[model samples]
Target: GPLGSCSSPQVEIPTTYSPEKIAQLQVYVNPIAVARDGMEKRLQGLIADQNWVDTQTYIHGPLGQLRRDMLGLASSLLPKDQDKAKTLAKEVFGHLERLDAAAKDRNGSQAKIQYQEALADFDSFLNLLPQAS
Candidate 1:
C-alpha cells in the first residue's frame, strides 16, 4: 500500500551546479515543488477529517522519499547550507518523529499538530537557503 495512488518514486537530482547550469537547478526544483504540494495536500486532508492511516499512507507512501530527496539535493546545491542544513534537518526530523509517535498513539489531533510543526520546519528549511559559496 505504500506505493499506492499518491506515492511515486523520487527521481534523483544532480547536485553538480554552476551559475550557467539552469537545467540542473530546474531538475532540483521539481522535487521541492512536489514536496510543497505534498505538504499542502496533507494539510488539506487533515482539515477535512483525515486520519493517521491516510496520513501515513500518503506520507510514507509518496511524500517520504520526496522529502529526503529535496533535503539531500538542497544541501548539496548550497554548500553554504552545510551547517544550516543540520539545524533544519534536526528540527524537521524531530517533528516527523513526533508525528510518527502521535500516529502510534492513535491521536489524530496530536499528529496534525506535529505535522504543522514539521511543515513549519520545512518552510524554515527553504527560507534559510543561502547563495552557494
Candidate 2:
C-alpha cells in the first residue's frame, strides 16, 4: 500500500514589527503630515494678520481633530516609540493652548512664540514616523 504524502508551507509569525508594517502605517501617517503642514501655514497667516477670530476658528475647527489624530497614531506606534509620540503630541497641544490664549489676549508676540514651539514639537512628532521611500 502506498501512503499519500502532503507538503505544507511553513508559516512564521512575526515577533516584531516589520518594514511592511511601518510602510502600512505611513499610509495613515502621510496624509496627516500634509494636512498639518497646510494648517501650519494657515495658522501662521492668521496669526500674522492678527485675525484672532479666524485663528480661533482655524484651531477649533480644522485643528481640533489633531489631538485625536495624534493620539490615534501614537496608539499604533511601537511600544518604545509610543511615549515619545504622546509626549510630543501633548507638547504641541500645550503650545496650541498658549496660542489660543495669546489670541485672546491680542498678544501677537506670544502667539508667534507658541506657534514656533508647536511647529517644532510637530516636526519632532513627524520625525518619529517612517519617512516616505
Candidate 3:
C-alpha cells in the first residue's frame, strides 16, 4: 500500500448481473472480474451495459476489450479507496438485483407469484453477491 496505492477495486460484479449473462450467453460474466481494478473505467461500462460498444468508441475493442483487458491489467500496489469501492460495489450489486428481477415478468401470470419468485431471487443475489464475489 505504499506510494498511496490504496484505491479500491475498479471491477465490481453483482450476482444479479451474473444471471443475466447466464441468460444471455455466460461468455462475458466470469471474464469480467478477472481484470484488474485501476485503469478500468471502460471495463466497468462494459459490465454495466454489456454492449461491448457503448458510446461507439469501441472501448472494448481488441485492445480495449472489457473482459480481455480488464482481466489482464494487474492490480495496483494497493487500492486507493477500499471503503468507497466496497460501497460502490454494494450499490451496483443492488442495481443489478433490480435489473435481474425486472426480467421475470414476461408472462404476467399470477403476477404475485412471479413477483415473489423474483423478489426471492433478487434478495438472495443481493446478499450472496458481496460474499461470493
Candidate 4:
C-alpha cells in the first residue's frame, strides 16, 4: 500500500500511431526530457533503488508531465520547436487515448494496433530526442 503514492486513471498505453499521435518523448538533456529525468531520478534513487521499474515510471509518469512542460519551454527556447512541441503535446494525448483503447478492448485487436503505434512512435520520438537544443 505504500506504493499507493502512484495514482492513475489507468488508460492503457497503445502501440500504434495510425489512430492518432503518440507521446514519443525524448530522453535527452533538453527541457522536458531534463525535467522528467530529474524528477524520476529522484524517486528512482530513493525508493525504487535505481531499478528498471522506477525507470519505467519516470517515462510513463513524470515524463508525461515533463512533455507538458516542454510546451511552455518551447515558447522560450527555439521558435521552430514551438510548433513541433505543440504538435507533440497533441500527439501524446491522442496516443494515450489509443493506448487505453488497446488495453480495454475485450478482443484486444484495437489494443494490438495501439501497441504497434506506441512501439513505432517510441523509436521515432527517441530519434528526435537528442537534438541541438
Candidate 5:
C-alpha cells in the first residue's frame, strides 16, 4: 500500500475564446453560478430577517467558496477578459466583507446597501462569461 500526495492535475486555460471554447468553459461555470444564486437568495432572506449571526454564518460557509469559484472562472476566461473578470470578483469580495462587517455591527442598513453592491458585482462576473447553453 503506497501513500501519495494525491494531487489533482492542473487544468489548462484555453488560449483562445472561440465559441467552442466558451461553450466548454460554460459547462464548468454553470454549476457555480447556480450555487451562487442559491446563496444570494439565502443571504437576502437572512438580511431581511435581520439574522446577523446566520448572515455571518452564511457568508463564512457558502459564500466563502465564492472567491475560489470566481478566480477559477476568471482564469478560464479569454486573456483579454481575465483582468476584468478578476476585478469584478474582487469587488464582490469587498462587498461581502462589508456585509459581514455590517452584520458584526448589527447594522441592517449598511448590510442592505452592501448586499446590493455584492449582487451587482456577482451579476457582472456572470455577465463576463458566455451564456450557458
Candidate 6:
C-alpha cells in the first residue's frame, strides 16, 4: 500500500484444452506473465530514482532467465502440429536477439522496449495455443 491504484487486464483461459496443456503453457510463461506489470513499473522507476546498476543487474539477470525460458519453449514447439506455433517461435527468437543486445549494451530504455514487445509476443503465443472450432 504505497500510493497508487491498480487494475488488471482480463485474459480468458482456454476451456478447449486439457489442464495439462494449459498448465504447461503457464510453466513457460508464468514468470513473465506474473511479472509483466511489475517489470514495466520497475523500468519506469529509473526516471525518478535512477539505479542504473541495479536495473542492469535485474534486467540482465531475471530478465535473461525469462528470455531463456521463452526460447526453450520455442525450440520445443512442434511446428508440424500448429502453423502458428512455428510463427510464434520465429517471432520470439527475433525479439530475443534484440532484447539480448539491449541488455548487453546496458540500454535500459531500449531493453524496456524489447521486453515489452517480447511480452506482447508471448501474449500472442497464448492466443495461438487454443484451437477454435
| Poorest stretch of ten by lDDT in candidate 5 | 124-133
Candidate 2 segments whose C-alpha is farther than 4 A from its true place? 1-20
TM of each candidate vs. truth = 0.67, 0.79, 0.25, 0.40, 0.79, 0.50
Q: Write the per-residue lDDT of candidate 2 for residues 77-116, one digit (tens) a residue.
A: 7776789999998898899889899999999999999999
Q: Which of the two, 3 or 4, has more lDDT?
A: 4
lDDT of 4: 0.45
lDDT string for model 1 (38-121, tens) is: 778764475347466666666666666655666665555545555676577677767777876777777877887888888887
Residue 95 CA displacement from its true place in model 3, Å: 0.7
Candidate lDDT (C-alpha), each:
0.65, 0.82, 0.35, 0.45, 0.84, 0.58
lDDT of 3: 0.35
For residues 1-133, could you state the per-residue lDDT of candidate 4 as single tens digits? 4655467677774433321222233222356455434643463352234243443454467556645654554343334344665565556546545644434443245544543464444334434433432
Q: After superposition, how far is residue 102 of candidate 3 from its true place, in Å?
A: 0.9
User: How well does model 2 score by local distance difference test?
Assistant: 0.82
Q: What lDDT tens digits, residue by residue, belong to model 3 across residues 18-133?
A: 44433443343234443223214543354345332331233223224442322222121013323443444344334333433433332223322333443343233234332344
- Candidate 6, residue 119: the lDDT equals 63
Q: Which runs of model 3 end up more than 4 angstroms from their true locations?
A: 1-30, 33-80, 106-133
In angstroms, how far off is 109's CA in candidate 6?
Answer: 6.4
